[PDB]
Amino acid sequence: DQAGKSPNAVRYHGGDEIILQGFHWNVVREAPNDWYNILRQQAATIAADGFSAIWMPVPWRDFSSWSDGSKSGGGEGYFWHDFNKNGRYGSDAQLRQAASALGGAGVKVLYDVVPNHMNRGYPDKEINLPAGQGFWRNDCADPGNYPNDCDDGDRFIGGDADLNTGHPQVYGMFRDEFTNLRSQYGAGGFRFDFVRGYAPERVNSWMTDSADNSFCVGQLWKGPSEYPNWDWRNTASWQQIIKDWSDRAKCPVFDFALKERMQNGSIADWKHGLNGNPDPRWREVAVTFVDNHDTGYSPGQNGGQHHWALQDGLIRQAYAYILTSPGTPVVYWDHMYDWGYGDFIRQLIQVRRAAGVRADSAISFHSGYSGLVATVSGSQQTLVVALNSDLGNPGQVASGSFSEAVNASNGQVRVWRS
Ligand SMILES: [Ca+2]
Ligand SMILES: [Ca+2]
């Protein structure tokens, strides 16, 4: 657990984390109020499985609800009303035991933080920010889902719940809460939600003031077509958009360029995500995932959100590639503990660890076979990865003595050098 910043000063924490997304969308529904006890009970497992960090759900209490026609939601944390740590996932006391047990087993706790907005109209809540005082986005003219004088980022839905995160007083509030999470809830890092809602520069602000040396990740989900026509990003690549954000916030960023290639291109096009980047400075800030709570399915209620879910026929291949490649991989809870991909994912974590693959290890792609075939230069071992390809032996693409590390789904997943 080497914990340092990247050459460009990005908060990647050594570049050797292996993160577990600690929850799915329907937990509040499936294990109402018992979520932190379940995690306290699994901390030992999570640690033994190889994770270095865990991404916790929003700690700020959410008692929102929404219906209209069979299909509901609420209380997951993205529409919180207070910094109180009560209900939905568990009590403040179970949170403390959860974090104390996780941290005690060597797993960092990363908190999901939601600064863009809050449940403004919730009755019984501890934070009350009046209108006309400049605390809210809507205190200014709001022409459209574009920055106004009261919010230097996009808005959430209508934008009636958007805070002016730039207001000294709204800024200091979040800053205090972050420090709080760190001194009393053992936070080891933060996962910023909806990063397009407020300046990236503010995220660096928050990290410098509260946990300068911790791990951070931002989720920027905004494609080129969502930027104005005159903006340079309207014609850039997904990777450029994502890297610019990282350059300014000084935090790694979820690799939405690889997610977009997993969803829209071929396995061969997977080399086009941030983590395939021939530049170490580019590749090393990527946070690769296969699915999260938004993009994927969740057990229970209506399959969850599944906004951009990867087909089950590519799950094994997706994990085999983020677990063996550069960037910092995230494993989805359900894949891991619900759906039975666990043993396969345990094998890969071991292989990543044994070859000493890290954020910045080099990777080269091999042109002449079908599927994706890559040579990943681990700091201890070289890996040869052949996904859905015709590659016959590792020696056809790399010099050296090789051993079968993984061999799954009728040869569709093959990884060599132990
Ligand atoms: Ca580390
Ligand atoms: Ca905003």
Side-chain angles (χ1 to χ4, degrees), residues 41-91:
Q41 288 159 39
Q42 317 305 315
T45 290
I46 306 175
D49 286 351
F51 301 104
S52 73
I54 193 176
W55 147 28
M56 306 282 269
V58 179
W60 318 326
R61 102 211 256 223
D62 178 340
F63 310 141
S64 53
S65 294
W66 58 258
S67 61
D68 101 278
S70 298
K71 208 62 80 250
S72 81
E76 308 95 0
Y78 305 97
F79 217 51
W80 57 276
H81 52 92
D82 264 336
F83 300 146
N84 195 290
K85 268 66 158 182
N86 116 5
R88 281 328 183 233
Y89 297 107
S91 68

Side-chain angles (χ1 to χ4, degrees), residues 116-117 137 151-156 162-163 165 194 196-198:
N116 182 79
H117 48 89
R137 163 184 189 99
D151 185 356
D152 62 2
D154 301 350
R155 78 194 207 185
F156 183 55
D162 278 57
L163 294 155
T165 68
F194 192 78
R196 65 129 106 187
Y198 45 78

Side-chain angles (χ1 to χ4, degrees), residues 27-255:
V27 151
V28 293
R29 261 165 252 110
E30 295 307 280
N33 292 299
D34 193 46
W35 199 253
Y36 298 145
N37 299 307
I38 290 177
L39 291 185
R40 202 219 319 125
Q41 288 159 39
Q42 317 305 315
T45 290
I46 306 175
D49 286 351
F51 301 104
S52 73
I54 193 176
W55 147 28
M56 306 282 269
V58 179
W60 318 326
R61 102 211 256 223
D62 178 340
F63 310 141
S64 53
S65 294
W66 58 258
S67 61
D68 101 278
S70 298
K71 208 62 80 250
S72 81
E76 308 95 0
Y78 305 97
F79 217 51
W80 57 276
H81 52 92
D82 264 336
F83 300 146
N84 195 290
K85 268 66 158 182
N86 116 5
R88 281 328 183 233
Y89 297 107
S91 68
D92 177 287
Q94 290 153 354
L95 211 206
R96 306 176 180 250
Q97 297 145 202
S100 185
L102 248 357
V107 182
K108 299 180 211 35
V109 340
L110 303 186
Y111 282 100
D112 198 333
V113 303
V114 193
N116 182 79
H117 48 89
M118 64 162 300
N119 196 182
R120 186 177 187 157
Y122 188 82
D124 160 48
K125 61 159 177 346
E126 294 169 6
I127 293 167
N128 282 100
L129 293 188
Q133 273 276 65
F135 294 128
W136 300 101
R137 163 184 189 99
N138 78 359
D139 269 343
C140 287
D142 190 0
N145 180 199
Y146 42 52
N148 76 2
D149 285 326
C150 281
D151 185 356
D152 62 2
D154 301 350
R155 78 194 207 185
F156 183 55
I157 331 196
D160 29 320
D162 278 57
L163 294 155
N164 169 16
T165 68
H167 184 113
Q169 189 181 319
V170 166
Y171 171 92
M173 154 187 260
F174 278 115
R175 183 252 286 100
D176 286 341
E177 182 48 14
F178 302 150
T179 296
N180 191 219
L181 223 45
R182 251 202 95 192
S183 76
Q184 305 196 20
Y185 294 95
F190 296 97
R191 176 270 184 185
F192 290 88
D193 178 73
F194 192 78
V195 111
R196 65 129 106 187
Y198 45 78
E201 272 84 24
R202 189 159 303 112
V203 165
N204 190 223
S205 276
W206 280 326
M207 297 293 285
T208 296
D209 296 346
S210 306
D212 192 52
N213 287 305
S214 303
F215 184 80
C216 48
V217 59
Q219 178 172 281
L220 176 62
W221 185 358
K222 185 161 168 184
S225 73
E226 314 188 52
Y227 286 94
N229 279 103
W230 46 253
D231 189 310
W232 73 269
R233 289 188 304 234
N234 179 276
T235 53
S237 63
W238 279 85
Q239 252 201 81
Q240 279 170 129
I241 283 155
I242 251 67
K243 166 89 158 40
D244 172 70
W245 184 87
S246 182
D247 294 350
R248 331 228 285 89
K250 303 294 221 188
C251 297
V253 56
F254 276 115
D255 203 347

Side-chain angles (χ1 to χ4, degrees), residues 1-3 12-17 108:
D1 203 312
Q2 184 162 208
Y12 75 1
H13 209 259
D16 66 351
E17 301 287 330
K108 299 180 211 35

Side-chain angles (χ1 to χ4, degrees), residues 354-416:
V357 177
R358 81 244 142 263
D360 66 356
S361 312
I363 192 174
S364 329
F365 301 98
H366 297 101
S367 340
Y369 293 93
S370 53
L372 199 270
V373 12
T375 302
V376 189
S377 295
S379 92
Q380 303 278 289
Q381 292 179 357
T382 290
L383 244 31
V384 177
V385 176
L387 311 173
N388 286 190
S389 102
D390 64 349
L391 176 67
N393 56 277
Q396 299 171 255
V397 110
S399 176
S401 268
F402 285 102
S403 321
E404 268 243 317
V406 178
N407 195 143
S409 20
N410 302 119
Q412 303 196 130
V413 176
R414 282 177 298 151
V415 173
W416 293 272

